[PDB]
Design an enzyme around this catalytic site. Structure first.
Site, short mmCIF file in Angstrom:
data_model
loop_
_atom_site.label_atom_id
_atom_site.label_comp_id
_atom_site.label_asym_id
_atom_site.label_seq_id
_atom_site.Cartn_x
_atom_site.Cartn_y
_atom_site.Cartn_z
N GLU A 1 -6.72 -11.59 2.94
CA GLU A 1 -7.76 -11.20 3.92
C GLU A 1 -8.93 -12.20 4.02
O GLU A 1 -9.55 -12.32 5.07
CB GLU A 1 -8.31 -9.80 3.63
CG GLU A 1 -7.25 -8.69 3.68
CD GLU A 1 -6.67 -8.51 5.07
OE1 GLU A 1 -7.42 -8.03 5.93
OE2 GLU A 1 -5.48 -8.84 5.29
N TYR B 1 0.80 -1.23 0.00
CA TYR B 1 0.00 0.00 0.00
C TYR B 1 0.83 1.27 0.00
O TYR B 1 0.39 2.27 -0.54
CB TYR B 1 -1.01 0.02 1.17
CG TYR B 1 -2.09 -0.99 0.95
CD1 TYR B 1 -2.81 -1.01 -0.24
CD2 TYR B 1 -2.39 -1.96 1.90
CE1 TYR B 1 -3.77 -1.94 -0.49
CE2 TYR B 1 -3.38 -2.91 1.67
CZ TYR B 1 -4.07 -2.89 0.46
OH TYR B 1 -5.06 -3.80 0.17
#
Ligand SMILES: [Fe+3]
Ligand SMILES: [Fe+3]
Lengths: 275, 275
Positions: free
Chosen positions: B191, B107
């Site tokens: 995730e 990110y």
């Protein structure tokens, strides 16, 4: 006096504040590996061709490595990674724990493959646990400073296995056992980098133990390791000279001192030209 | 009443006691990846061709993901991995922390590449922090049971990002941006597995919160996520229907309930046939 420590004091993640730390995480990262990359098929053929002294020894060294990476990882979880509150040193410790888990597995894949009967598997040992009072004590002591405890596990990962990694490297030339010797190459490289990292942390610590304290931890670590390989489980069993092994330990223990930024304590040369 | 919990009570590492847990660690392990495998070269060409609403949005969703995997990892370090005292669930949590660190990096590699000026980088945000009172509270609460806290982070990793992963998948077909869309594929798979793992732990917990408690945590999680994507940062900015997004959230929140072993709360279908 923890407020004055950049390493430990609280703080406000790609603005890179600590390049030397980050460069090592990515070095650990780049050396990722899992058990299944180590082919153990071609081994029982060689394990079969061993002597029985070479099996009581290899089995026991593997077993010492089982009761060893579990204490390393119990320290980074419930002590080290909690305390160190800077970003780069947490990634490394995070990656380290991941690999310590893979090491722990690899040693168990090996022991399961070289020992099919669970009743054998059970010794664990009054042989091995000499270090508990030294080691598990530096997990358990609430007076032990970070600095003392960083040097402590520098010793575990750099002195305490050093002889055992030397043994497998000795077997490797005499001759192969690709499971044992390929794992060992990977595992001894990981422990060097973990041991180097412990050194890098020490360097970044304002408040560190006195040289005499650092010498004590290391000298004492060496004696316990020397005792394990020359009495408790002599490298004699696989044809190696004890004196030379006692001396290698000391070369490695000196190489740690230089890297923590201190003088040699033993002044011995490396006896083993394969290491 | 922690003595009665096989998951949490103390205990005596390849005698595998928990196969279902172990099978997931090796699934996480086998999906290892690092930032440098995601080529971000071919992206500014596409980022340049975007609208400016599509940039205020992609930049903000990336930034929400920065203030997000840091709270997930602050919980597994100083809470979860400490408590859970069974071997297989510690390897997974150990590997999870390693990947949460790589996600956090990815990110930041993205935000550094799409935003060259640091003064822009600084918003962090009263926009985002709506979840702090919900989320960081379930780190901070000493009354919150494990069971409540496992469901809590099931919600963070499975509800709270669900819409954002949906957005990038929507951009991907309209059209490419391989950095954003290849990362997102890898990160949304991670995730899902972390979220599945949270579910597996819940299943192994004797003492769990009442359905009403579980519904509360999830329903409330959904509303906060719905609020973020329809008001605070409407998926309108990249051409998507709000209602459909509010509805996807609910499909995902229902799919979590079924997997924690409970009934659907919303009964909505999946609006997005790409997900
Ligand atoms: Fe190590
Ligand atoms: Fe996650």
């Amino acid at each position: 006096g923890v407020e004055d420590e950049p390493l430990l004091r609280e703080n406000p993640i790609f603005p890179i504040e600590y390049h030397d730390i980050w460069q090592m995480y990515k070095k650990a990262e780049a050396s990722f590996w899992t058990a299944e990359e180590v082919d153990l098929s071609k081994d029982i053929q060689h394990w079969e061709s061993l002597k029985p002294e070479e099996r009581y020894f290899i089995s026991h060294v593997l077993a010492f490595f089982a009761a060893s990476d579990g204490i390393v990882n119990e320290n980074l979880v419930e002590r080290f990674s909690q305390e160190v509150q800077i970003t780069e040193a947490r990634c490394f410790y995070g990656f380290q724990i991941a690999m310590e888990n893979i090491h722990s597995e690899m040693y168990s894949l090996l022991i399961d493959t070289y020992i099919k009967d669970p009743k054998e598997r059970e010794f664990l040992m009054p042989c091995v646990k000499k270090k508990a009072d030294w080691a598990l004590r530096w997990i358990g002591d609430k007076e032990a400073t970070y600095g003392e405890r960083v040097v402590a596990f520098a010793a575990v990962e750099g002195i305490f296995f050093s002889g055992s990694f030397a043994s497998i490297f000795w077997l490797k030339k005499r001759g192969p056992m690709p499971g044992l010797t390929f794992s060992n190459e990977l595992i001894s490289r990981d422990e060097g980098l973990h041991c180097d990292f412990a050194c890098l942390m020490f360097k970044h610590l304002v408040h560190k133990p006195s040289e005499e304290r650092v010498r004590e931890i290391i000298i004492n670590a060496v004696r316990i390791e020397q005792e394990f390989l020359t009495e408790a489980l002599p490298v004699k069993l696989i044809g190696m000279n004890c004196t030379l092994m006692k001396q290698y330990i000391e070369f490695v223990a000196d190489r740690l001192m230089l890297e923590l930024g201190f003088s040699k304590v033993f002044r011995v040369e490396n006896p083993f030209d394969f290491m």
